């Protein structure tokens, strides 16, 4: 569905990823 | 305040089953809710040293302002926000002001544990009374904002479960951060070691009770850190 960590990271810092990391 | 939590997720299709399960497990059907959060950071145009009056290191952090929005005003505050007088329907509204710390360190943590400093803004007055001006007066600027809509469940011992969808808001358009499904969150707010180990247990029993169906885990500390820092190229 999506990456929990990534979603959280957005709410805390505002960053959206256009590429896949790690 | 100490917030102990665990997270999970499900795709849109898993909704009904999950709602049915949480309703039986908790005894109550879900409760609809929303919240708008606006995040602010220290003004980059201004620059100050990062130290105390005692010359102690202080780390720059973001401030989070949050409040509910009546559902009737949802389009107005998101899509039709701009052109002020283009709409469907003095001082500032009440807001919750929060600064959080990166979760507690520790390998093999059974839950995430985050410290949260919060105060409540009730109202304003004067020349620049808009919450925006007030944030500027503190030396901060608007960075980003997101809307969250979901359902919550009240359970025993203060355990709360939120099934949420998140949308970032910009004139260019709101994009659903949770596109595909729902972000699942289970947490308890703790104002003594005992109550902390007791709270962990409650979360662990919920995790245990959903094992096999939906998994709840501890998110990465770094993903729950709002400190301001750079212009770093990811990987």
């Amino acid at each position: 569905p999506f990456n929990v960590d990534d979603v959280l990271k957005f709410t805390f810092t505002g960053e959206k990823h256009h590429h896949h990391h790690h | 305040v100490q917030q102990l939590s665990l997270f999970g997720s499900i795709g849109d299709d898993g909704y009904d089953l999950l709602i049915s399960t949480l309703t039986t497990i908790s005894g109550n059907p879900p409760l609809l809710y929303n919240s708008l959060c606006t995040v602010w950071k220290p003004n980059p145009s201004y620059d100050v040293e990062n130290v105390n009056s005692r010359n102690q290191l202080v780390e720059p952090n973001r401030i989070k302002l949050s409040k509910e929005v009546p559902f009737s005003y949802l389009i107005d505050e998101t899509m039709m926000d701009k052109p002020l007088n283009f709409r469907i329907l003095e001082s500032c509204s009440p807001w919750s002001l929060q600064i959080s710390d990166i979760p507690a360190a520790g390998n093999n943590r059974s839950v995430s544990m985050q410290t949260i400093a919060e105060t409540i803004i009730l109202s304003s007055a004067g020349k620049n009374s808009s919450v925006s001006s007030l944030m500027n007066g503190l030396g901060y600027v608007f960075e980003f904002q997101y809307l969250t809509i979901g359902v919550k469940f009240f359970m025993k011992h203060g355990l709360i479960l939120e099934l949420q969808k998140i949308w970032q808001i910009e004139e260019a358009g709101n994009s659903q951060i949770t596109s595909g499904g729902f972000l699942l969150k289970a947490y308890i707010n703790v104002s003594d070691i005992d109550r902390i180990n007791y709270t962990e247990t409650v979360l662990m029993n919920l995790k245990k009770e959903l094992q096999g169906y939906i998994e709840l885990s501890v998110p990465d500390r770094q993903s729950m850190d709002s400190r301001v820092a750079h212009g770093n190229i990811l990987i």
Partner: protein
Amino acid sequence: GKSAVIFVERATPATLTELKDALSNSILSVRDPWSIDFRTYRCSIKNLPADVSKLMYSITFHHHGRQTVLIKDNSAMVTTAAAADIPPALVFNGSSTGVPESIDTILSSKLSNIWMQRQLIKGDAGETLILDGLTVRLVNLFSSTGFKGLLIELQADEAGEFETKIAGIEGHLAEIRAKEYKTSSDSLNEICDLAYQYVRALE
């Protein structure tokens, strides 16, 4: 509602009582004691755009909500550290954790690099004197350097006759030989002007 704050610069811990007696024949009853904290913060930003103060005042009322009003550049922000004062809706949707703290604690622990506490004036065991349509509060303000002065808080529901009420109290000050004092009844939402008045009278 209306209010005014009188700060007696030139005075001693006794001045309070002297003024307390000049009203002995005007008093009616005495309600519970009050308290108040007056903080002064100095901004550490060094590019501060011209004509933007570097000063911000924090006025904490005790059991006036355990509320704290921030005042900077003629603007005010009312905050509360009381879980009981949280709007119910904010607790329900999770915007609030239900466990707030003081804006001052936040300032000193999370924003200390930007804001430094310069002074802290406290007024304990204040007195609430109730007269005819005019409530008069008295408290001795103390700093980390001993006595700092006398503070008179004048609150009156009676929107009408007030300018007279204030002039009257200033008169009883002339009697007790309390000269060289500052009075403020300025304005910028009650709690806000009251807070502002303290600033005008103390800054």
